[PDB]
Structure formats: C-alpha cells, structure tokens
Amino acid sequence: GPHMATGQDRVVALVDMDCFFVQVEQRQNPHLRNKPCAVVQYKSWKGGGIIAVSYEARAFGVTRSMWADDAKKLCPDLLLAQVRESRGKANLTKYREASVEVMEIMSRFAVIERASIDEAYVDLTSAVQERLQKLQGQPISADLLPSTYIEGLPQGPTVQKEGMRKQGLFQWLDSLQIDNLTSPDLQLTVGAVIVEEMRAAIERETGFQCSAGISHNKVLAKLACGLNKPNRQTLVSHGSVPQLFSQMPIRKIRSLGGKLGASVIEILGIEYMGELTQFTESQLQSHFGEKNGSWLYAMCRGIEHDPVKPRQLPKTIGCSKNFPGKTALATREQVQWWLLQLAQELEERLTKDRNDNDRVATQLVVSIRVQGDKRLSSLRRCCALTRYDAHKMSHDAFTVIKNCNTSGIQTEWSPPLTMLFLCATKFSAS
DNA sequence: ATTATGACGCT
DNA sequence: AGCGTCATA
Ligand SMILES: [Mn+2]
Ligand SMILES: [Mn+2]
Ligand SMILES: [Mn+2]
Numbered sequence A: 001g002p003h004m005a006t007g008q009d010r011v012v013a014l015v016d017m018d019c020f021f022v023q024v025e026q027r028q029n030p031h032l033r034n035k036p037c038a039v040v041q042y043k044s045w046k047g048g049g050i051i052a053v054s055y056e057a058r059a060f061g062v063t064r065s066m067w068a069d070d071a072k073k074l075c076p077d078l079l080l081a082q083v084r085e086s087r088g089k090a091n092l093t094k095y096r097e098a099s100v101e102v103m104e105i106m107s108r109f110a111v112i113e114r115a116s117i118d119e120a121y122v123d124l125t126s127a128v129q130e131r132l133q134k135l136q137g138q139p140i141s142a143d144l145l146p147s148t149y150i151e152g153l154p155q156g157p158t159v160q161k162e163g164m165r166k167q168g169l170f171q172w173l174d175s176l177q178i179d180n181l182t183s184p185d186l187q188l189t190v191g192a193v194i195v196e197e198m199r200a201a202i203e204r205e206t207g208f209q210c211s212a213g214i215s216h217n218k219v220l221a222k223l224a225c226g227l228n229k230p231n232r233q234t235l236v237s238h239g240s241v242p243q244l245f246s247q248m249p250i251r252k253i254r255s256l257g258g259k260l261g262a263s264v265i266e267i268l269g270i271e272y273m274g275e276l277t278q279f280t281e282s283q284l285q286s287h288f289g290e291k292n293g294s295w296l297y298a299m300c301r302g303i304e305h306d307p308v309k310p311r312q313l314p315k316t317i318g319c320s321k322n323f324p325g326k327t328a329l330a331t332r333e334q335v336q337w338w339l340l341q342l343a344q345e346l347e348e349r350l351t352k353d354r355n356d357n358d359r360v361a362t363q364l365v366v367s368i369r370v371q372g373d374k375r376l377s378s379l380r381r382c383c384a385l386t387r388y389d390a391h392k393m394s395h396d397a398f399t400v401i402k403n404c405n406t407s408g409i410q411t412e413w414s415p416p417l418t419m420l421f422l423c424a425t426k427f428s429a430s
Numbered sequence B: 001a002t003t004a005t006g007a008c009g010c011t
Numbered sequence C: 001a002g003c004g005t006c007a008t009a
Helices: A018-026 A068-072 A093-108 A124-136 A161-175 A184-206 A218-227 A241-246 A259-269 A273-278 A281-288 A290-300 A332-357 A390-404
Strands: A012-017 A037-041 A049-053 A079-082 A114-115 A121-122 A147-148 A210-215 A234-235 A315-321 A328-332 A363-370 A378-386 A410-425
Touching: A012 A161, A012 A184, A012 A218, A018 A037, A037 A068, A049 A068, A093 A114, A093 A121, A093 A184, A121 A218, A124 A184, A124 A210, A147 A161, A161 A184, A184 A234, A210 A218, A218 A234, A241 A273, A259 A273, A259 A281, A273 A290, A281 A290, A290 A378, A315 A332, A328 A332, A332 A390, A332 A410, A363 A390, A378 A390
Parallel strands: A037 A079, A147 A234, A210 A234
Antiparallel strands: A012 A121, A012 A210, A037 A049, A114 A121, A315 A410, A328 A410, A363 A378, A363 A410
C-alpha cells in the first residue's frame, strides 16, 4: 500500500547518437550525406568489415558485422568511408574526438555517465526540480516537446506517423497534473523538455543527430531510447511498463542479452519481461543468485536503482589487434614489431590523455590469443607502467608473454598469435 | 576472418 | 589478480 517503493524517485535519460561513426564521416564529407552509407574497417578481406550503417542503408538490409562485399550485394550504390589506418592498424581517434564533443555539451546540463563512445546517461532529477520551480505550475506546451513520443499512447476510443506522435503527446499532456511538483509523470515530462534542449544543442553545435530515452532509471531510459530512433526521443512512464513489458522479449533488456537472459527463459519457461512478475524474489534469487534475483524482481516491475555515475572519461585506454587466418604472428621479430606498433599508439593516446585530463596510468595489462583457443583472450598478465615510453612498454609486454612460446627455438613463435592487446589502467591524479 | 574497444562481476 | 560476461561503433 503506502509503503511499496515504486522506483519513481529519479529522472534519468539516455542519449545515444544516431548511426554515429557514419554521421562523423558525413559531417566531414558532404557527398555522403542523405545516402545509403556505411563505415568499414580494412578492405582486403571481403571488402572490409562494416561497423556502422546509415538508416538509408538499413532499408536495404545492410547491417553491422556484414562484409562490405556482401552489403554491396544488397545495396549496389552503398557508399563507404574507411576507418583510418595508422601503424598498420585501425585507429579510432576521429570517433573518440567526436565523442568528446558530444559529451562536453551534455555535461553543461548535468553530470554524465559515459556508457559508450556514443552514449551517456544523465540524472536530471535536480535540473527538473529547478525547472519546475521556475515554471510556476504552467502547463507544459506540446511545442516544448517537438520530437517526443510517449510510449503506449495514443490509446482508447490519422494514418500518418507525425500525426500519431502528436495524438499520443496530446493525450499525455491533457492527463497531466502540473499542480503537483512531486508527481513523477510531471517530472518525466519536464525531463523530456530538458532533453529536447540538450539534443537541440548537440545538433546545433556538432551537426550530429541523436535519440534519447527519458524514464526513471537507466534500463528503462536505454530501452526507451531505441523505441523511436532515429532523431526522436521517447518517454517511458512508470505506468507504461506493464503493457510494454507484457510483450517485451527478455533479451531486449540491458544485461539480459546473453547467457543469463537465455537461462531466465529456459529455466522459468517464459518469454517476456512481464512474465517475471509471477515469481517471488526468493524464487528468482534461487535460480539466478542473490543480486540477479533481486535485480530481476524489481526490474520486471520497472524498478532499478543503479546510479548514474559521475564519470565522463574512460577509465582504461587500450590498443588491440587481431591477426586472423594466415596472418597470425609466428616469429619473434613479428611479435615484437606489432607490440611496438600497439605501444606507440598507446603512448600517443596516453600522452594526450595526461595533458587533457591531469592523470597518469600506473598498470599495463598485456593480453594475447593463441591459435586454437575459442576464447576472446587466452592469457592476460599485468605489469607496472612507470613511463609513457612505447619502447619500454613493448619490451615489458614481450617479457610478460615470452614464456607462452611453446617452441623450442627462440626465433619461432608457436602456437601462432592471433591477437595482441595492450591496456593502460589504474589511473591516479597528476 | 567482424574487429576494436571498454565496464563490471566472480572467486 | 586473471578470467568471464555483456555491451557498443
Ligand atoms: Mn548510436
Ligand atoms: Mn550506442
Ligand atoms: Mn548500435
């Protein structure tokens, strides 16, 4: 009754860029704008691997992970932009720098949690309270929410898409109680007003379009964001959760897209998020552990407490390269050459990081994969990182992996290496 | 032969 | 610590 927590204490948004690497390349090259377009890495093997796809290209069935040669079969006029290569490897600096542009704008509105290269969570609870105190109990005009969808509306007693959006927004606004500064639905609405402002600023100041979700926690905000991509934002209210979740595959919820989610489906014999409500918290804990069980019990009711962390910068800086098929490294000179290439890119990024962000990494993690191992990583070893010097770091990395060579001979490396990974970690203020 | 990342959980 | 899981361009 009066004591059941409803998880409506916060206003949380998730802002996610549309087709982000494609937009970065479209800004740079106007010829790519408003075209079926994709971003590819490498080229020699099957035309290269696609890692981002414009919405025009998606209409032809082009997806991420697709080889460009195969994408061209679906979409002959597909335009491509290639990821930069430096020191023999893909280099993602352009996209990291574009990300910083977006993150710095968002940070003007609230403290953000960088969740990927192209998205961040915002806790807007305080900003909403402030905007509410200025407003005076005026109704919120539809004109303040020009790109907002209200999930679940319209409903009850037009054949165009923008028409439907407005109908839902109208129903939503008319149901509001703007007289109550503690009403969660009102708080979400004001959150959505602020996010319109945020998204307008991002587009004005970078040229990049994005989508967003507004809800009471990170999982619902993330889910909401995807509902009306691209270039739109979606409000998912607490009240909208039972209908939304009644047909929502469990795998769609963040963190349930892998083995845990599959086990929820298999063990319980269910399909949709809403079906979880019929289990006790103890039942869920018995199957999925104490933490997962409590999390699922609350999550299927729309409730989650994971805070928006105040962290705008990545906490690791890493350099990685695969050596697939017959390109696997089989000599000492090869292994050392590539460790140096990775280490030189790492030095570059680390030095820039120290100057920009007043911090220094203190641990170097070295990871390799061996031919025959299905696992992402075969071996991970750490050592000290005391100087930002590529030759030292590459010499150190070789030392910690040296004993992995099962070859009797010194000159050969066996079994051949199919991945090298250098990562700088454990930052301290400097 | 999707690749290049990056956060967090477990023991 | 080293490994595993999950995630995103
Ligand atoms: Mn995106
Ligand atoms: Mn994203
Ligand atoms: Mn994506």
